[PDB]
Design a protein around this motif. Structure first.
Motif, PDB file in Angstrom:
ATOM      1  N   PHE A 144      19.253  58.582  51.342  1.00 38.80           N
ATOM      2  CA  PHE A 144      20.019  57.778  50.396  1.00 38.80           C
ATOM      3  C   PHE A 144      21.439  58.308  50.237  1.00 38.80           C
ATOM      4  O   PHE A 144      22.403  57.531  50.214  1.00 38.80           O
ATOM      5  N   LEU A 145      21.588  59.633  50.128  1.00 39.62           N
ATOM      6  CA  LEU A 145      22.928  60.200  50.000  1.00 39.62           C
ATOM      7  C   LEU A 145      23.769  59.926  51.243  1.00 39.62           C
ATOM      8  O   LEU A 145      24.942  59.533  51.139  1.00 39.62           O
ATOM      9  N   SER A 187      33.708  43.676  50.509  1.00 36.49           N
ATOM     10  CA  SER A 187      33.466  44.488  49.328  1.00 36.49           C
ATOM     11  C   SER A 187      32.615  45.688  49.716  1.00 36.49           C
ATOM     12  O   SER A 187      32.267  45.880  50.883  1.00 36.49           O
ATOM     13  N   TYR A 188      32.282  46.506  48.715  1.00 38.09           N
ATOM     14  CA  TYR A 188      31.459  47.683  48.971  1.00 38.09           C
ATOM     15  C   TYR A 188      29.992  47.304  49.143  1.00 38.09           C
ATOM     16  O   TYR A 188      29.242  47.992  49.844  1.00 38.09           O
ATOM     17  N   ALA A 189      29.564  46.209  48.508  1.00 44.99           N
ATOM     18  CA  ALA A 189      28.205  45.720  48.715  1.00 44.99           C
ATOM     19  C   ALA A 189      27.991  45.284  50.158  1.00 44.99           C
ATOM     20  O   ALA A 189      26.919  45.509  50.732  1.00 44.99           O
ATOM     21  N   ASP A 190      29.003  44.651  50.758  1.00 42.19           N
ATOM     22  CA  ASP A 190      28.932  44.299  52.172  1.00 42.19           C
ATOM     23  C   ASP A 190      28.749  45.539  53.034  1.00 42.19           C
ATOM     24  O   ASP A 190      27.940  45.544  53.972  1.00 42.19           O
ATOM     25  N   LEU A 249      27.439  48.377  52.093  1.00 40.26           N
ATOM     26  CA  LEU A 249      26.110  48.936  51.866  1.00 40.26           C
ATOM     27  C   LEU A 249      25.046  48.163  52.636  1.00 40.26           C
ATOM     28  O   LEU A 249      24.107  48.755  53.180  1.00 40.26           O
ATOM     29  N   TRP A 250      25.179  46.837  52.687  1.00 41.48           N
ATOM     30  CA  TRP A 250      24.269  46.028  53.494  1.00 41.48           C
ATOM     31  C   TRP A 250      24.374  46.394  54.972  1.00 41.48           C
ATOM     32  O   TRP A 250      23.353  46.608  55.644  1.00 41.48           O
ATOM     33  N   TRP A 251      25.604  46.488  55.490  1.00 41.29           N
ATOM     34  CA  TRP A 251      25.786  46.930  56.868  1.00 41.29           C
ATOM     35  C   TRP A 251      25.163  48.301  57.091  1.00 41.29           C
ATOM     36  O   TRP A 251      24.496  48.531  58.105  1.00 41.29           O
ATOM     37  N   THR A 309      22.713  49.978  55.446  1.00 35.66           N
ATOM     38  CA  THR A 309      21.257  50.026  55.466  1.00 35.66           C
ATOM     39  C   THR A 309      20.713  49.382  56.738  1.00 35.66           C
ATOM     40  O   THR A 309      19.859  49.970  57.416  1.00 35.66           O
ATOM     41  N   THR A 351      22.087  49.193  59.559  1.00 33.06           N
ATOM     42  CA  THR A 351      22.367  50.062  60.695  1.00 33.06           C
ATOM     43  C   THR A 351      21.457  51.285  60.693  1.00 33.06           C
ATOM     44  O   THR A 351      20.950  51.696  61.742  1.00 33.06           O
ATOM     45  N   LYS A 362      27.267  42.076  60.922  1.00 32.32           N
ATOM     46  CA  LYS A 362      28.382  42.918  60.514  1.00 32.32           C
ATOM     47  C   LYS A 362      28.486  44.091  61.475  1.00 32.32           C
ATOM     48  O   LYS A 362      27.509  44.819  61.672  1.00 32.32           O
ATOM     49  N   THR A 363      29.658  44.267  62.073  1.00 35.22           N
ATOM     50  CA  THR A 363      29.929  45.369  62.981  1.00 35.22           C
ATOM     51  C   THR A 363      31.336  45.884  62.726  1.00 35.22           C
ATOM     52  O   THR A 363      32.218  45.113  62.331  1.00 35.22           O
ATOM     53  N   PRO A 364      31.574  47.179  62.930  1.00 35.99           N
ATOM     54  CA  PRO A 364      32.941  47.702  62.810  1.00 35.99           C
ATOM     55  C   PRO A 364      33.780  47.293  64.012  1.00 35.99           C
ATOM     56  O   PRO A 364      33.324  47.353  65.155  1.00 35.99           O
ATOM     57  N   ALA A 406      30.898  55.422  62.382  1.00 34.83           N
ATOM     58  CA  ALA A 406      29.559  54.850  62.451  1.00 34.83           C
ATOM     59  C   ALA A 406      28.686  55.608  63.439  1.00 34.83           C
ATOM     60  O   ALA A 406      27.515  55.870  63.158  1.00 34.83           O
TER      61      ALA A 406
END
Ligand code: K
Ligand code: K
Ligand code: K
Ligand code: K
Lengths: 146, 354, 354, 146, 354, 354, 146, 146
Positions: F168-169, F191-194, F196-198, F200, F202, F211-213, F222
């Motif tokens: 988690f950290l 946003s930061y939620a986006d 966090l979704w990416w 998790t 990944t 979503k990809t960098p 990454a």
């Protein structure tokens, strides 16, 4: 090699040396008495093991049908051929079915109920040893199972 | 008989490299593998339209080489199998050729030969190409791989069933909960079957990406349920791997013991002693020349048969594993023998002095 | 000789931090790693067109710093290697520089130097950049990683072969069955090679998503076959991980035993006693002054040589592991000695009283 | 250090003290008899181990070629240098090729066939001890292998 | 003093549920967790534009509730900490509040309070929200998780380094080989950095699908290299999992032994006996009333101090683990004692009868 | 009573195949499984619009067959349950039908029957279809799967909590760092939620690809964070798998011990001896015919009751596992008995001769 | 509690009862002789353990500085307080710092060097037992470490 | 089967044969003395185990309330029925609640405190053996628990 009736009578005469009383059975007393008369010295536990190998009734005796079966069969059965061949294979690391004459000599005179020099000399003479000094033990097993 | 004996040694070398390889002999079979696998690849590349022509021209030569190699190998193997006493003479050769993998090899060889001959319905001639992986199937002797896998799977049935059951329940629940949240907003989740497909593809961590949750409630549910269920979907591999490794360690342990030993050595001796009853110089004396009291020698032989049978049993038993309670058993035997020794001292002191 | 001795201690400290690091000395090599890896990254970023200029200007300075650092390190190492008796004098230095990794280091250094000098076909000058990972390869002493991996892989050959074989069969079958169901409806599955590509990408759980089944029969088949085969494609990692962990545990237990001990200590003593036969004050007496009966001292030396050879063997043997059957062996020795003691009592009672 | 013929004759004269009968062999009887005459008391198992280290024929004897080889070689071989150096390294935890004078003294007088105080005093005198009190044992090993 | 004693028992119950929970007390901390984690989620949902308003209105009430709860908890904990003798009086309270996690709690509470007060640069007021996960960090007592992970990682350093090294080499090689095959046909593989990105994303089995090989040579190379390297990229998880499980099993066996026992019980006894030297009725007699020969009682006390120190040492030692060679040691002790007993019989028989 | 006895044997065979299957009897329950699971699949295929008609027509016949089969099975089971003494007579049948899974079976059967009868709000009639997986739930006897999973999870709580916490950290940190690098260039990271979704998606290696960098800094971050955290996200599966396998090995070990034995055999004997006190021919003699001194027989019975109670306890205890310290205990008993024997010799020698 | 000079002289007078010869040392002979005069019967191994707890020189003696340190310190040190508290915690399964009076009584009279009934009666009287019958042993540890 | 007052008086009269002194307790002395008078020979450890099964006070005695409870209960309790049934199940590998007459005979006369032939003959007569020779032991357990 059908078991004939004269062969059965010769087995019966040997069986009667053990069972001198005519009771139709061989116990550790009868077996061990004949053995010690010849100068052998089995233990009681060795006499029980021997009788147990052929005592189907489990009552500590050998009867004539069990005696006759053992005598007719000797080592000719397929179980004997396989197990003897498996014993040689313990000492065949190559897995090629060969064992050296000198390695056979070491195992026969240094492990187990060691063969005397004269016993092991007769054994190596009887195997058709190759010129290298290597013994094909699977044909040695068929000569003892024939 | 030096030449016949050298010929027999060559026969035995060929039979050993062909049927019971060990050590360096593997470099032969590996080659055969690289000859078969390569062929298979080419056939796959023959299914592509853009690469069909080249694949066919390469496959023709490769398969001709393969035909020649495997025909020569079959002939050499059937010839060299004569070294064993079981297979000798033309009857022994026929008996050797009666094994199932040998007749399978003959079938595959003659089938490929007749196929290429008829080539001189080619769709069937190309479909017969998949018969080549049997030449790798034959490498598994009596199906040792299937037996090992089945043993280890059967030893761990309860854990595997538990993992699959909990994973199935989690999958059903997560699919339903994500479907409820995504139905109206996302067209990927049109029905419950769509949600189940998404859920299985997500939970094994395949992640195609054709179906994804678009709402944030669906995303939170998916994250939580993935954290919960991905561990359940990966449990069987870890269970089976740890089981295999523990089995390997436990087999390597027993190798060090070398407990069987003495029994195999004694069996050969009891067999030789029994056999020599009927041919030893020890019995070729005037004394033994049988006419007056035949039973004496018969009784001596009967004793050697009984001892042979005891030695065969003790030899067969050695294969069976033994417990770690032997140390307690030796202390019991040692204590009892010593306690009986102090009693024998006590009785003699009490006898003489009283 | 205080200054020479302090200088020798400094030499030994440098040699220990450079060749046999332990504890804190690692903080040196880590630095070297961070100097090499970083450089590598920059070279990769030099392959991008948009970031080429900056990467080149940074790489110039970084590589100049690296040249200076590694030249100084080579000089200091070759100098400090003189602490050992094997390498002393210019002949000893030349013997030290004959090791393969040392001449590899010299080659890499002089090659980078000459490359930058010729910079003052730059494509080859940039392609020579990949030679820098050898400075991390040199960290693996005698290839311990390859040997450990090979040992553990060889110990588990049967399980790995079984997993790969069953996985290959499942892959072929699943690809064929999905191809049959998807051929006419989906253009992703144009040929059987396409289906095999989809099947491998699915079964390792990579899941690119370029090929997916569109029909529901194909989806049901894919779900079932994935459930079946994904565990087979993940088995080798679990097997090898459990094997590595079991090996680590089994090596940790052996260290606790500390069985070798006594043999190493006795070997030094037998060696000193043998050596001192030819220089001890014990032999510098009128008695030993050799002229009348030289053989007496030679015989005494011959005995010390034989004892030295016994101690060297017992010392080498200690390295070999020992079984857990020693307890049975000590009971056998203890019982036998005690049973013989009761016999010696019994014989004396029977001698005196009778 | 080519083995000379006079050196061979001096080895022969020592060999003949063991083999006083002129049989060309040294058994446990001959070896142990000379040893006990000097006041040593080896056990039978120690005499067998000693002979076994140089008995290639495996028949429990030392012949003159085996005796001469052992005497010519002493500890000069590379196997001896390596094993002695490995024994010191058991007691070198730092891995720097050093051992303390006081630690050497403890190991020599407290483990194994302990050295007497006078023996260990001569041993520490012979090593060129540094001013700290640390001994470079790898140069100590070369002095015993020279 | 019944009421004061009941109050002290209540204090001890509160201190036990707050600082040293066990069994049911966990149902408290779990609640706190569900209060913090939930809050965190809401803050994340405050970063989305479409859901910002609702998230703010919910977060206000949730954070007010959280402020009240944690202030009350801090007060109750600081009060209940007085049960221990170490913290008593206002000085003891101040000493209790000097612990780092306590002052961290005070800081976080007062910071959130002052932030909401200033709310009555709100960007900073929202950025201070991430300070709440420290209330879950405080649950890890003295960083047991980090220490366990570090211990197990350090015990398996060689295997992990080997896996990472071989995986890195395979990654570099596979990326280069696929790049060479895909450069002209596929625009995904424009440079070598693109190929390295594809290779890493493929080898960890993430499989984004943004880059895929289009040619059949690239696909065959990718399949082979994936089969080779995916096992290397998954090895560390299996190694560490097996290590953790083996450590847990090896910890369970030690608990069963219960070796420490007797030493702790004897230490309390030696301490009581020493203490009672200076207050026992045993010393309040005319005999002991010290005036003529004070040293006698001092000598008796000195002996009890020495025995106390022996018992404290034996007690500290019990914590250390013991080997499985104790059975050999008891046989050595038992045999030696018995062999000495037969000698004592032998000497007496030889003395009387001779 | 031959026919009644054959009928009772048939009853017992049916009860054994239905309630306590072993060996071949499983081939029955497997069939039931294949009857239920199939049905479930069809209901899922009824949610698709294109395949609704066929699914309904197939489901009608399948569910009629299922109704008949399960009604017959319920009747046969309730009848065959009479073989046990506990359930006999109509009262015993009612007592057997009071078990929770039996009344659940009755409920499910009658509910499906009444649903199909009312079919002759069909949405509810289709929603009642999910009640069929309870017929697979009933196969788990007293929830053995949940109990096994809970036991193994509780035994490894610390490791699992550590893995989840560190993961988690790492997830939070990696999401933040990638968000900072991708915010302005990539619209996936709005946003930061986006982020966090990416992160998790990944880190569990699902890799949807939505979503990809796009920047190279984000890609390097990454790659590093994936290398770091993917091992943490896969740890629980490996931990639990190794735990399950070690538990299986440790249970297979104890089977070989066979320690309980003798106690069960002795309990039946003490029970028979107590029972026979009141009916044996041994007590039907003129001597025992009770009129003059009744207490004598009562005292004899009281002794047999006490011995029965000792045997019942020793029998219950056998179930408990035993330690490996028994060998030390037998040496302690053996040594003590022998040392006492030498003392008894010593005292007698000293008595007679002195 | 600064150690005063009169307190030092009283320790010296006790020390001189052991070291009656004025040699400045206490060996197992001096220690064990005084102990047996009071009717104690330590073993030799118990006398060695006792001396070893305070013998920094490792030569098997106690000198006056070591004797004075032990006597001045008693149990007041922090190591003693912690270890005694750890010993009670062995018998505190709840982890609440309490132990039952009856459980303390069982452990004191049934394990180790068992307390007599009168010893354990004085020990339970000295702990301020609560009305339930539960003992707060951490304040019991501070009374013995004060 | 309510325990009646006359049944209590008959238990009291048996209890008084053990406790002949009227002390209200049965120790190992009283129990073992009555047992040996009948020709039994329990050991001291067997007498302690027997008393411990019913001694709730833990002081090594049986009082009349404990004696009466044991006598009133016999084997009728549910714990006895379950444990006896569990003991039979040890020897029921099929799991069908059956055991062979010959297998019951082997276990009863060859394990544990072996039954005599006549004891085991009465036991097999009392079980309603089926015509095959198989015994339903769960109804055998209810006859001993009735
Ligand atoms: K994956
Ligand atoms: K994936
Ligand atoms: K994917
Ligand atoms: K994807």
């Amino acid at each position: 090699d059908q078991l004939t009736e004269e062969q059965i009578a010769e087995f019966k005469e040997a069986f009667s040396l053990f069972d001198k009383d005519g009771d139709g059975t061989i116990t550790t007393k009868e077996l061990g008495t004949v053995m010690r008369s010849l100068g052998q010295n089995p233990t009681e536990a060795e006499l029980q093991d021997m009788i147990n190998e052929v005592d189907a009734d489990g009552n500590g005796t050998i009867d004539f049908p069990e005696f006759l079966t053992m005598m007719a069969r000797k080592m000719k059965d397929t179980d004997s051929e396989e197990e003897i061949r498996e014993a040689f294979r313990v000492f065949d690391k190559d897995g090629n079915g060969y064992i050296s004459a000198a390695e056979l000599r070491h195992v026969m005179t240094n492990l187990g109920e060691k063969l005397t020099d004269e016993e092991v000399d007769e054994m190596i003479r009887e195997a058709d040893i190759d010129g290298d000094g290597q013994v094909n033990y699977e044909e040695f097993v068929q000569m003892m199972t024939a | 008989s030096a030449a016949h004996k050298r010929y027999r040694r060559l026969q035995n070398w060929v039979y050993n490299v062909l049927e019971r390889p060990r050590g360096w002999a593997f470099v032969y079979h590996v080659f055969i593998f690289l000859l078969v696998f390569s062929c298979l690849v080419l056939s796959v590349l023959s299914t592509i339209q853009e690469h069909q022509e080249l694949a066919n021209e390469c496959l023709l030569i490769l398969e001709f080489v393969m035909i020649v190699v495997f025909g020569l190998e079959y002939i050499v193997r059937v010839w060299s199998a004569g070294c064993c006493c079981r297979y000798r003479g033309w009857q022994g050769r026929f008996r050797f050729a009666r094994k199932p993998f040998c007749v399978i090899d003959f079938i595959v060889f003659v089938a490929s030969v007749a196929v290429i001959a008829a080539g001189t319905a080619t769709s069937a001639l190309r479909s017969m190409r998949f018969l080549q992986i049997l030449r790798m199937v034959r490498m598994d002797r009596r199906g040792g791989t299937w037996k090992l896998l089945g043993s280890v799977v059967y030893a761990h049935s309860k854990e595997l069933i538990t993992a699959w059951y909990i994973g199935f329940l989690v999958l059903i629940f997560a699919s339903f909960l994500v479907y409820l949240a995504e139905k109206d907003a996302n067209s990927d989740f049109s029905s419950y079957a769509d949600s189940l497909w998404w859920g299985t593809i997500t939970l094994t961590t395949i992640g195609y990406g054709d179906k994804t949750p678009h709402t944030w409630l669906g995303r939170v549910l998916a994250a939580g349920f993935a954290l919960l269920g991905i561990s359940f979907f990966a449990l069987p591999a870890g269970i089976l791997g740890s089981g295999f490794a523990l089995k390997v360690q436990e087999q390597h342990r027993q190798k060090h013991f070398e407990k069987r030993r003495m029994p195999a050595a004694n069996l050969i001796q009891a067999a030789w002693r029994l056999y020599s009853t009927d041919m030893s110089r020890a019995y070729l004396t005037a004394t033994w020349y049988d006419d007056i009291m035949p039973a004496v020698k018969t009784v001596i032989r009967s004793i050697r048969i009984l001892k042979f049978l005891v030695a065969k049993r003790k030899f067969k038993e050695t294969l069976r594993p033994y417990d770690v309670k032997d140390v307690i058993e030796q202390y019991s035997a040692g204590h009892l023998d010593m306690l009986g020794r102090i009693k024998s001292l006590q009785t003699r002191v009490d006898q003489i002095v009283g």
